Amino acid sequence: DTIAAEHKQEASVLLNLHRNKINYLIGETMARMTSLSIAIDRPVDIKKMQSILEKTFDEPRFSGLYFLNAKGDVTASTTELKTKVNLADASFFIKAKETKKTVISDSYSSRITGQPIFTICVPVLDSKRNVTDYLVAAIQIDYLKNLINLLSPDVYIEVVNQDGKMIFASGQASHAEDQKPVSGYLDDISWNMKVYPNPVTI
Amino acid sequence: KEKDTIAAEHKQEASVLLNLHRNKINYLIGETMARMTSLSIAIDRPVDIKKMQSILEKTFDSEPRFSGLYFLNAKGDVTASTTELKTKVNLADASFFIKAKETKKTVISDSYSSRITGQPIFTICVPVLDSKRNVTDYLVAAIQIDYLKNLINLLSPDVYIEVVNQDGKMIFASGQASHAEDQKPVSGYLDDISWNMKVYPNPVTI
Description:
Chain A: Oligomerizes, probably forms homodimers; oligomerization is assisted by FloT. Interacts with FloT. Chain A: One of its GO terms (cellular component) is plasma membrane. The structure is a homodimer. By secondary structure, chain A is an alpha+beta fold. Chain A is built from four helices and ten strands; from the N terminus they run ααββαββββαββββ. Chain A folds into two domains: 92 residues, PAS domain (Beta-Lactamase), CATH 3.30.450; 98 residues, Beta-Lactamase. Chain A is elongated. At the A-B interface, α1 and α2 of A face α1 and α2 of B.
């Protein structure tokens, strides 16, 4: 009756390891892109940028690294493209352009690779603080799931956005039966993580 | 006998603080490695020293974590520095430099007293490589030990926490040892350095 309250906190423990893992991953990525922005010679030479992105990508975290011009055209790209791609219609792009600040997108299906991702988009400013370009880092949802799964294969964990859209779930739902989850939002993106304690069992 | 039930709870709290505090340090160290690594990739050759000086200043700004950021030539001369240097400074004799040069990979040093600032620090050193994979320069980021200490202490004033390297050197300690009396610590190593953090449970009372 009180191995209950322990299975509970054991799940609070899982919750924070996993949140932290994801927050770290996101923060580390933001910081990689922010540093690139600062280090690179302006105006940005597209050939050098291409090379930089490739060196940075060659990290299965990424679906890809991309560079955008003011219009939204993909001018540098880890993934070879058959046809020209424009990311302007993209929500994160719009938000990035208006705020002139880094943006973390909700999960979606990459127009470029076709797989579920989320993107970190960092605008590049000139001297007068106009947005001239964008660094774009796309991470596979797949990667996040697997990171969670390796740590806790046998324990159910559900991640859902602010509107109840399933981002992903790790482990077997059957483990959640009769259990209330210990839950919590991530820092940089409005994803709520729900960890289900295991049953009391002897 | 219910004593042992409050004790288990105090122990559990110790483990929670242990994980909380390592993560904070791990993140700090990991993010710094990432930044230095990106700088090392993004800089155009031949490296313009004034541009590099400017990048380090920007990277350093509003980041009390750092004791300082520095750039080294292949010999180990500090050629750009967020600290105003009064003499020429060479680090070729530093352990982290020797390891960096030989491994050609990032090095996280043990703690030591900075030649430059006199304070206790540890440094992250990223070698910058040639097309030919020859080391031409070094990025060096120094982190104030006391920044970490005060970070932890602010969060957990009432809990005694020691961090110790492999050789038993005390890196830092936070809190009052009186709060650990008759306690065994819950312990664990940092991911990027061989530092062991020992978090002591509080004693039971009421």
